Amino acid sequence: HMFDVVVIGGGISGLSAAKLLTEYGVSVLVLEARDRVGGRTYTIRNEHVDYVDVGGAYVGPTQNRILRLSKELGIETYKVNVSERLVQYVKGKTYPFRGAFPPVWNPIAYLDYNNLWRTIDNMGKEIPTDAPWEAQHADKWDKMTMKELIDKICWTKTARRFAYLFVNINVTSEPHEVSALWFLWYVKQCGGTTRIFSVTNGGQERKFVGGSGQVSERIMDLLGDQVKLNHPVTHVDQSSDNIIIETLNHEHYECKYVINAIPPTLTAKIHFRPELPAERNQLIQRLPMGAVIKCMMYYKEAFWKKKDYCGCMIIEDEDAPISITLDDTKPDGSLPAIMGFILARKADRLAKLHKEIRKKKICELYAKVLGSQEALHPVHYEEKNWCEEQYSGGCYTAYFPPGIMTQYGRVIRQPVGRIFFAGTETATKWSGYMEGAVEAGERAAREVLNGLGKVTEKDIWVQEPESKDVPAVEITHTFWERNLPSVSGLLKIIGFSTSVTALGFVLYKYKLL
Ligand SMILES: Cc1cc2nc3c(=O)[nH]c(=O)nc-3n(C[C@H](O)[C@H](O)[C@H](O)COP(=O)(O)OP(=O)(O)OC[C@H]3O[C@@H](n4cnc5c(N)ncnc54)[C@H](O)[C@@H]3O)c2cc1C
Ligand SMILES: COc1ccc2c(c1)[nH]c1c(C)nccc12
Ligand SMILES: CCCCCCCCCCP(C)(C)=O
Ligand SMILES: CCCCCCCCCCP(C)(C)=O
């Protein structure tokens, strides 16, 4: 019952924190609300699936903390399948393709699309990773929704529609719901558009053998009985020098420091004393979670592979259940599966259906999309609705509605007295991700170790050596990607050379050429 540190939450962020503190000889108790660890990562194990991640799954280049943390725990990664053709499903029609983004054949649409990604990334360049509210344009951009920005950026309908999907896919919410400032920041802090969206050399490159649930399971092993499951913290009281923590079953723990390692929306329910600053209380009640239902469809045979598809479908169609999928076949070829997400508005919609109506609907879309009736004969179906996770609030992460970032956002990871705040939402790189959970756990641990006098100020924020197993190849854009004009830019240029072609006709008739 008496510890130096209590960590509230045994997600990756909380366990990381607890694991670091333990290395330093500090006593830590982790108080985990659920009957398991790992939080928004959850590897289910039954004999239908062997194992499957129903929560966070993927890792890739530049995600150095999670790779290092997982490697040290004896967890191996494997590459996501992209040997075959990706597909785009738009307007009833399936378009196979290669590369990260679907091809845009229409020349004007192409300039639009191209300019959209470059502009997302250039606008990002201005946003400080760790102080987005300090952006030169923070106030202006934070007032916009991402729908407004997209519609301001994009002339074509294709580009707009796609960009709205891009939003859904990344922040599992609707572009009208999210600040353009926060969204530009969110893609920036994941490496940019190409890194965030890609499989190869991107955030979706890899998965863990045996599941990402294992990152948390094994740290809980190392911590032994220093991790208590079924202890949701309901009160935290730092009035006196021993902080008193109370759990839902009325147990009391005391400690010198607390690391809050749960998302904002759950932070918002803890009864703190003294009360948190009023900015902070506003902040943490105004960050909603996104909406995802992760659905895994199992088949006997990876029939998509026969048709030369990898199982990655980018599904751009309002009435389709799923938005995006990946092959989820086991690394040795066994238990073939498609992983699909139901995202944003569509998740809230679909969640009101029965499971077997959701199943049926997904199989039908897949038959349609992959053009094969074999899609209608799944051998098993696994799903997790994160909207209905009481100790998660939703997935993958919190979004910032317009206004919130410049109004209350500065204090997102500021300590309140001896309470330090971890959780992926407070990470500055790959925040929203398992990677950002580790950055944030280890940095809060270090904030506590600085307090205990065991680590210096300089040492709180430590950069991760690059993984040698999964190194980061640099994202490059072609000459044409860099320099093609936006639609609007075309018009400017064309006006300049219709004009001048005219003057070369004035000069030619005058004969002064
Ligand atoms: C469907 C899904 C897909 C995603 N895909 C990916 C992916 O492919 N790659 C990736 O990197 N990330 C992905 N993410 C996000 C990733 O899962 C999270 O960013 C990461 O797990 C968050 O870690 P955390 O430690 O910060 O928070 P959490 O994992 O939420 O940990 C919080 C912990 O606190 C507990 N808790 C809540 N309230 C209390 C309380 N009051 N007291 C005590 N404990 C409490 C919870 O039970 C939980 O165990 C996804 C998440 C989901 C749900
Ligand atoms: C471009 O194709 C995909 C496939 C899966 C994901 C994706 C893009 N972006 C994702 C994110 C941000 N999280 C989980 C899965 C995916
Ligand atoms: C002046 C018109 C602009 C020219 C650009 C058109 C590019 C289309 C072909 C590239 P893709 C392989 C389909 O992405
Ligand atoms: C003068 C206008 C015509 C320009 C030709 C268009 C070339 C597009 C190729 C696209 P990428 C090779 C992927 O960057």
- Six token digits for residue 72: 């040290």
User: Using CB atoms within 10 A of its CB, is residue 25 exposed (0-12), middle (13-18) or buried (19+)?
Assistant: exposed
* 163 touches 151 (CB < 8 A): no
Please give the DSSP secondary-structure letter assigned to residue 242.
S
- Tell me the CA distances in angstroms from 278 to 207, 234, 275, 421, one per residue in order: 40, 19, 8, 16
The amino acid present at 434, given as its one-letter code, is M
Q: In 144-277, which ranges are continuous DSSP H helix?
A: 146-153, 157-171, 180-189, 193-197, 213-223, 264-267
* DSSP assignment string, 137-167: THHHHHHSBHHHHHHHH--SHHHHHHHHHHH
Q: Report yes or no: 209 and 52 within 8 Å, Cβ to Cβ.
A: no
Pocket of ligand 1 (CB under 6 A): 8-14, 31-34, 39-41, 55-58, 232-233, 261-263, 266, 292, 294, 386, 391-392, 395-397, 423-424, 432-435, 437
Q: Are 88 and 95 in contact (CB under 8 A)?
A: yes
Technique used by the depositors: X-ray
Q: Which domains are seen in the chain, by residue range?
A: 1-39+61-76+209-287+401-461 (3.50.50.60), 40-60+77-208+288-400 (3.90.660.10), 462-513 (6.10.250.130)
Label the pairing between strands 5-8 and 28-31. parallel
Q: Helix/strand/coil (H, E, C) string of 26-40?
A: CCEEEECCCCCCECC
Cα 474 from Cα 360, distance rounded (Å): 42
Distance CA 358, CA 112 (A): 35
* Residue 496: CB atoms within 10 Å: 10
| Token pair in block for residue 252 | 């009391």
DSSP state for residue 289 in the 8-state scheme: B
Counting ligand 2 atoms within 8 A of each CB, the residue from 54, 58, 170 with the most, and so the one to mutate, is 58
Q: Left (φ > 0), alpha (ψ -120 to 50) or beta: where does 429 sit? A: beta
Query: DSSP secondary structure string, 291-321?
Result: -EEEEEEE-SS-HHHHTTEEEEEEEE-TT-S
Q: Which atom of ligand 2 is nearest to the CA of 100?
A: 1
Q: How far is the CA of 109 from the centre of ligand 3 (A)?
A: 9
Q: Which atom of ligand 4 is nearest to the CA of 477?
A: 14
| Summary count for the chain: helices (H), strands (E) | 18, 21
Cα(40) to centroid of ligand 1, in Å?
3
Pairing of strands 85-90, 309-316: parallel
Phi and psi at residue 479, to the nearest 5°: -55, -45
Cα(118) to ligand 4 centroid in Å equals 15
Cα–Cα distance between 343 and 170 in angstroms, integer? 10
The Å distance, Cα 436 to ligand 2 centre, comes to 16
Residue partners of 318: CB distance under 8 A and separation at least 6 = none
Asked whether 268 and 262 are in contact (CB, 8 A), the reply is: no
Q: How far is CA 47 from CA 52, 78, 245, 335, in A?
A: 11, 21, 40, 10
Judge whether 351 and 310 are in contact, CB under 8 Å: no
Type of residue numbered 70: S
Residues with Cβ within 8 Å of 249's Cβ and at least 6 positions away in sequence, in order, are 230, 231
User: In this structure, which residue's CA is closest to atom 1 in ligand 2?
Assistant: 197
CA pair distance 115, 155, nearest whole angstrom:
10
How many Å apart are CA 447 and CA 443, to the nearest integer?
6
DSSP codes, 91-106 = TTEEEEE-SSS----S
Cα first-last separation, the chain: 92
Residues near ligand 3 (Cβ within 6 A): 103-105, 107, 110-111
Amino acid identity for residue 335 in this structure: L
